Design a protein around this ligand. Sequence first.
Ligand SMILES: O=C(O)c1ccc2c(c1)nc(Nc1cccc(Cl)c1)c1ccncc12
Ligand SMILES: O=C(O)c1ccc2c(c1)nc(Nc1cccc(Cl)c1)c1ccncc12
Ligand SMILES: [Mg+2]
Ligand SMILES: [Mg+2]
Ligand SMILES: [Zn+2]
Ligand SMILES: [Zn+2]
Lengths: 324, 324
Amino acid sequence: QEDVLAKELEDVNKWGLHVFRIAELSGNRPLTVIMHTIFQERDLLKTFKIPVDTLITYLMTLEDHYHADVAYHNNIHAADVVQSTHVLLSTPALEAVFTDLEILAAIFASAIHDVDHPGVSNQFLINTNSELALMYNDSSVLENHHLAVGFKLLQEENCDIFQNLTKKQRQSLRKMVIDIVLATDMSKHMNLLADLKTMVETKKVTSSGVLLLDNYSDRIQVLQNMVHCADLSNPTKPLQLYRQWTDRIMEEFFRQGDRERERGMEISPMCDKHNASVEKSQVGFIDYIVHPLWETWADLVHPDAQDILDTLEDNREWYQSTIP
Amino acid sequence: QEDVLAKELEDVNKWGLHVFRIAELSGNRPLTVIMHTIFQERDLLKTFKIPVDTLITYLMTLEDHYHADVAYHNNIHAADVVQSTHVLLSTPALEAVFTDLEILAAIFASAIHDVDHPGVSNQFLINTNSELALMYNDSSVLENHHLAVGFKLLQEENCDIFQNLTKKQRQSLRKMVIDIVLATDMSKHMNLLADLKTMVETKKVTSSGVLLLDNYSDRIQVLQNMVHCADLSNPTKPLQLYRQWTDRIMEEFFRQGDRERERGMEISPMCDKHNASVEKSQVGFIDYIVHPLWETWADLVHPDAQDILDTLEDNREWYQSTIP
Ligand SMILES: O=C(O)c1ccc2c(c1)nc(Nc1cccc(Cl)c1)c1ccncc12
Ligand SMILES: O=C(O)c1ccc2c(c1)nc(Nc1cccc(Cl)c1)c1ccncc12
Ligand SMILES: [Mg+2]
Ligand SMILES: [Mg+2]
Ligand SMILES: [Zn+2]
Ligand SMILES: [Zn+2]
């Protein structure tokens, strides 16, 4: 089993990694083994003097604080978003564009971005007067919580993977990680996409053909959109992966709708298992959210993302075909 | 005691209320007695059907969560900002511009806006890796906490002063209160003032007198700047009031600087008791922050803020005269 898992992890640089199989082969530690593999691939342990035992201890603790009984927003999703961000970071149009600290921030942000997710939405937490919504004044409730937990866990025994960064490196990384995870709040999607469109329309490219990003605002905007794309990457994956992700988010949505029904609240969209259309919901999600985002990302890094966009368009055609 | 208490309460509608006397005559409950008196003057217990005993129970509970060993950001300051907001709400150029709910939101926001303040700044909390900064991801750390405490205390026994608001009224009040208190973060001052200035250059007014605000964005922005003005109203008050407030904020600042010194941190501006110029700092505070804010406000409600602006200019005159 160790051999086959190592074989599977050789695909860490590929879109379409068998992340559910890696979850199985790793003993439900996809986030730990995928993060560790990526950190070794990018030489991040040597670059930031991260003790390997500290890295594993933090990663296992972080993975533990994802909920194993949440169908979608769990450690497999976190590992998926981490690996997808890792691939997007390697795209040729971004070669040598980001520093080692920005790469570390984007990967760390992806790892923590949904930690301790309870499997219900921000609006559900707000409408039920949850403790979380009271703590965070109804504003990016979950995303603020994911950040707070992700950073707090660094203070557990032998968990401070950033112990050997300088003070300015720690300060800069913390700000970047916060800016990235707050951007995963879906209520910010339209604004994030509008800014990504503006950047594509005004794109500048250096003499070496890579993206020119000469200020923090543009650099962090690209990283925010990158992790957002990774978060919304399920419909761009091979269909056997996409359908499993769809099964899982529908189970989470239906369980939220069951709670909304039991409480006498209006049922959130796609959350009523009695009047649901899973296939129409996926086509509309692709048409109105995922394809607009990925077509814009593909424009930013053209032609690097052509195969990903082609898979997305094929999957939309397939889900559409199941409707008539 | 209670009848001398009453005659000074008589001028709750006047700039320059004797709040320190009121704090002494009330047994250190100025927030409770001033809030109660204001709700009667504006008929808020009747319009919103608030039980008078629940108003008092929550007010004493809220007042208790202000720190008695914090020289400035305590219950006396909270009572002063309440009373100043209450007066600014009667500006002629703003006669009933705001509905009864918006009036309630501005006054409630004023009461809770610094609750549980520890006497140190957001930057101190961030740079010391405090639990509060960890919870709130370095963003409006204190102001988010003030809100969360102020709302959580409503869930104590016989404290839900909003129990008889409709569910939509409770949701609308909550949103406005959050929008207002978050705007008291001094890091947002320039953005709030620039928008007040833009409103000035786009000011639409009647011939009858009043300002004309149609959309929620313009409206909440005036109330944000209103409570901001009340928060920064000390230098516009009669001089013997202003001088007492200055003694208290300098004591609080010096105690923070003593902590930045003993921890080896960079001492915040005005916090080094061995290198302080209290009078120069007041003149600078007025010149760069308080007067530009209050003169922009004065223009928006021209000319009802003329006397407040005059008194500020007089106090800047006097503080300047104390520099040799
Ligand atoms: O936040 C997540 O993790 C999250 C995760 C999954 C979905 C989502 C948000 N939002 C969806 N829809 C959506 C959301 C906002 C606006 C509009 Cl028009 C549509 C959606 C649809 C279909 N399948 C999965 C999702
Ligand atoms: O936040 C409060 O409660 C608060 C309370 C009092 C002061 C303050 C903020 N900020 C001051 N100065 C300041 C603050 C920000 C930027 C710049 Cl240039 C200056 C200041 C100066 C003098 N006296 C009292 C204060
Ligand atoms: Mg999320
Ligand atoms: Mg404050
Ligand atoms: Zn996610
Ligand atoms: Zn204040």
